[PDB]
Amino acid sequence: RPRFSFSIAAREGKARTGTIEMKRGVIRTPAFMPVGTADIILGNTYHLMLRPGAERIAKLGGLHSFMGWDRPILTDSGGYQVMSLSTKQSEEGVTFLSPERSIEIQHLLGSDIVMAFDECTPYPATPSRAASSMERSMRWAKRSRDAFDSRKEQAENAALFGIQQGSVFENLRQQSADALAEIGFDGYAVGGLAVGEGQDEMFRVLDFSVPMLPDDKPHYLMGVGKPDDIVGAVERGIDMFDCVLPTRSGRNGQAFTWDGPINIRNARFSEDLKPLDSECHCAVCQKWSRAYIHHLIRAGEILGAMLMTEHNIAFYQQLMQKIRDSISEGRFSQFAQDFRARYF
Amino acid sequence: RPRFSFSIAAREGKARTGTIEMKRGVIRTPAFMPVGTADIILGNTYHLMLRPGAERIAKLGGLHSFMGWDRPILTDSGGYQVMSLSTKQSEEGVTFLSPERSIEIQHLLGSDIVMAFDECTPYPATPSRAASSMERSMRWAKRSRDAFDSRKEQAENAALFGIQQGSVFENLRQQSADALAEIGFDGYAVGGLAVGEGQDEMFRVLDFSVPMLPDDKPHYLMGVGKPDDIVGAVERGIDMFDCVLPTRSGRNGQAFTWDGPINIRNARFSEDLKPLDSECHCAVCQKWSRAYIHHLIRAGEILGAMLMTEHNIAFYQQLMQKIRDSISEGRFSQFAQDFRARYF
Numbered sequence: 001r002p003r004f005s006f007s008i009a010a011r012e013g014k015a016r017t018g019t020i021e022m023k024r025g026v027i028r029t030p031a032f033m034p035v036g037t038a039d040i041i042l043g044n045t046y047h048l049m050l051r052p053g054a055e056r057i058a059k060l061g062g063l064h065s066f067m068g069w070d071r072p073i074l075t076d077s078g079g080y081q082v083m084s085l086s087t088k089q090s091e092e093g094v095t096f097l098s099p100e101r102s103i104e105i106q107h108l109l110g111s112d113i114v115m116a117f118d119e120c121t122p123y124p125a126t127p128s129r130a131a132s133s134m135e136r137s138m139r140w141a142k143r144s145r146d147a148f149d150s151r152k153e154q155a156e157n158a159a160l161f162g163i164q165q166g167s168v169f170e171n172l173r174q175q176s177a178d179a180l181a182e183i184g185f186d187g188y189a190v191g192g193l194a195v196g197e198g199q200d201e202m203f204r205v206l207d208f209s210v211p212m213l214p215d216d217k218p219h220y221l222m223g224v225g226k227p228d229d230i231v232g233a234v235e236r237g238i239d240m241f242d243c244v245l246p247t248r249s250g251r252n253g254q255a256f257t258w259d260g261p262i263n264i265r266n267a268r269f270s271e272d273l274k275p276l277d278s279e280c281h282c283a284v285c286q287k288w289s290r291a292y293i294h295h296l297i298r299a300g301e302i303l304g305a306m307l308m309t310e311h312n313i314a315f316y317q318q319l320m321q322k323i324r325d326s327i328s329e330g331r332f333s334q335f336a337q338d339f340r341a342r343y344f
Numbered sequence: 345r346p347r348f349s350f351s352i353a354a355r356e357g358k359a360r361t362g363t364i365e366m367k368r369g370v371i372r373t374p375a376f377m378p379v380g381t382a383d384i385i386l387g388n389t390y391h392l393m394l395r396p397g398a399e400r401i402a403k404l405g406g407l408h409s410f411m412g413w414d415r416p417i418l419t420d421s422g423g424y425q426v427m428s429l430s431t432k433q434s435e436e437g438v439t440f441l442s443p444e445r446s447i448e449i450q451h452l453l454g455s456d457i458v459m460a461f462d463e464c465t466p467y468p469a470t471p472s473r474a475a476s477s478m479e480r481s482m483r484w485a486k487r488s489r490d491a492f493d494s495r496k497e498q499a500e501n502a503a504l505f506g507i508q509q510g511s512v513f514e515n516l517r518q519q520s521a522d523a524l525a526e527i528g529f530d531g532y533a534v535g536g537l538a539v540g541e542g543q544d545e546m547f548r549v550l551d552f553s554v555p556m557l558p559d560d561k562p563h564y565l566m567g568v569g570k571p572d573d574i575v576g577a578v579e580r581g582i583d584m585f586d587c588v589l590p591t592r593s594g595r596n597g598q599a600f601t602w603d604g605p606i607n608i609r610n611a612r613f614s615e616d617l618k619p620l621d622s623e624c625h626c627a628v629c630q631k632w633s634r635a636y637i638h639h640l641i642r643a644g645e646i647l648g649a650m651l652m653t654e655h656n657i658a659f660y661q662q663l664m665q666k667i668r669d670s671i672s673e674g675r676f677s678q679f680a681q682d683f684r685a686r687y688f
């Protein structure tokens with residue numbers, strides 16, 4: 001396969017479905033990208049750079065070998081997580097990480113899809129602040145680009161995505177898209193959302209923001225989201241998603257179903273013999289009832305949380321497959337409406 | 345198959361290997377019986393009788409259906425766990441559970457191998473106290489027997505095991521064996537060990553205690569134990585084991601290997617690319633290194649503990665298979681010696 005190729009096989013309104021081809025494999029879009037601790041998984045740049053360290057992961061053969069995953073891997077650039085989990089900023093980078101070091105770390109980890117090093121602007125932000133932040137991220141984008149291109153193994157085998165900022169402002173989203181397109185990336189992420197703004201506002205921003213990106217490249221919405229977030233985002237032309245929700249939910253007793261999320265610890269499930277979800281083809285739903293998973297989690301059994309997690313991961317992939325088929329078949333708008341009618 | 349049949353296919357010194365046949369399946373001996381939350385798994389009588397309650401498990405179709413396990417299930421009688429996790433005693437039973445109620449609960453859960461309701465005498469115990477306790481357990485054994493026989497579905501489809509007490513005293517172990525044999529059970533457990541006495545003392549007690557049980561019935565050593573405990577116990581004529589160690593170890597960072605247990609969190613494993621154990625055929629060892637499992641557990645990832653747990657469960661079953669084959673082949677005493685040389 002090539003280093004990177006994106007082909008759109010079908011469209012419905014703003015929604016698209018197709019494929020990304022890379023040397024380690026094909027990614028069907030729209031795609032959900034789960035954390036690896038699916039066609040592609042997410043590595044944890046921030047964590048790995050601290051434990052065991054990027055150099056050590058390299059010494060150990062790279063993330064593919066480390067995690068026993070030979071398919072594509074995406075890494076974020078780390079600053080999001082530094083700012084929210086670690087901080088002193090400068091034009092150079094963040095002390096607590098610069099574009100160049102971020103790209104180097106992602107190279108050492110060996111990821112296939114590399115994210116430029118950006119600043120996820122805080123919400124809410126004034127126009128001036130949003131602009132200043134966005135402008136810095138675009139200088140950091142060019143630095144990221146240059147750093148990525150300077151490493152031949154990286155430039156020839158991986159792909160680099162640019163990240164749009166601009167907060168909730170249309171003119172800044174536009175300038176950002178402009179700067180990113182001028183530099184040129186393999187793909188474009190919509191950053192700076194899922195920062196506290198709420199779904200209506202996120203959708204409003206996506207309505208004008210996603211058409212500003214190159215149509216012939218994938219669009220990645222970072223950190224999004226609930227099942228209903230994803231459907232609405234795909235309606236607005238997003239192709240790729242990542243979110244910790246399915247795995248965090250699963251650790252905390254929450255399961256996603258076609259009828260909405262459920263809290264399995266609640267006593268109403270203690271004698272419920274139906275599977276987690278009635279339609280779900282996942283292994284968990286093939287074998288065990290809500291009553292047993294309830295039992296395990298209430299008892300503090302690690303098995304219960306693992307079963308919940310597997311189910312949620314599978315639910316998310318089933319959702320994306322249903323989105324892909326419906327777009328392909330020209331019935332995505334009906335699916336969306338049917339989905340929401342039942343989910344809510 | 346029949347309700348219950350035990351056949352010994354080969355012997356080596358005191359050690360035996362063979363099979364238990366029951367309606368839900370065959371159990372190869374010597375057998376390790378893991379907790380189900382293998383040819384047979386253990387249900388958790390004490391927990392289940394409290395949550396969701398035995399009657400409710402019955403309403404839900406019995407433990408086989410609840411846990412999605414159609415093979416034999418063993419249940420303990422609950423008093424061990426009441427005394428150590430819950431208490432007022434009487435000849436009637438324990439307030440915090442009597443022989444009759446214990447047997448009823450085990451019936452409601454639908455287990456295939458039912459344990460009589462006994463008292464695991466505390467360690468250390470004086471001869472007088474050990475005797476008084478043992479004598480009560482033997483009256484409770486007869487009550488258990490009668491209760492089990494009174495329920496036709498139980499008496500025709502399940503099996504009942506008697507439990508020897510007597511602490512560390514030979515004469516009391518003998519009287520206990522005598523009373524149990526007089527009542528008559530499908531199998532005989534050696535109770536009242538793994539109570540703080542240490543391996544040398546446990547082996548010393550097994551040396552005289554196991555030959556006192558009927559040779560033509562299975563011998564179950566309750567709550568035992570580490571890999572080296574099991575090998576020594578099989579040397580002394582034990583056929584069945586249960587122990588929380590593999591699952592608790594796995595939750596706490598400890599893995600069993602042919603070279604002894606290891607604490608995977610230790611920094612020495614952070615760059616160790618060997619699997620958990622080099623010989624282990626388990627799925628975990630087929631795919632992931634010590635370095636990654638180290639990483640997961642240090643990060644608090646539930647996946648790491650699940651992988652450790654699966655490995656330990658598999659290690660234990662590999663141990664039992666190696667014990668069975670060597671006894672069958674007449675080389676168990678060499679295996680034992682080779683095992684200990686490397687394990688320690």
Ligand SMILES: Nc1nc2c(CCNCC3CCCCC3)c3[nH]c(NCCc4ccccc4)nc3cc2c(=O)[nH]1
Nearest residue numbers: 042043044076077080120191192193194222223244245
């Ligand atoms: N460069 C960059 N990253 C962002 C991220 C991280 C995406 N997930 C990375 C992934 C790497 C592996 C470890 C896990 C994270 C975001 N996450 C969110 N929302 C989360 C909101 C949320 C939703 C559910 C639960 C918690 C938080 N907004 C984000 C905006 C940006 C952004 O502008 N730039």
Ligand SMILES: Nc1nc2c(CCNCC3CCCCC3)c3[nH]c(NCCc4ccccc4)nc3cc2c(=O)[nH]1
Nearest residue numbers: 386387388420421424464535536537538566567588589
């Ligand atoms: N009737 C009865 N039960 C006993 C038990 C419970 C066996 N495991 C049940 C199983 C049911 C499902 C939940 C888990 C337990 C014992 N466990 C131990 N040693 C444990 C010593 C130990 C070893 C490693 C870790 C913790 C404790 N000695 C025991 C003696 C007796 C006894 O005389 N009578």
Ligand SMILES: [Zn+2]
Nearest residue numbers: 280282285311
């Ligand atoms: Zn499922």
Ligand SMILES: [Zn+2]
Nearest residue numbers: 624626629655
């Ligand atoms: Zn293994």
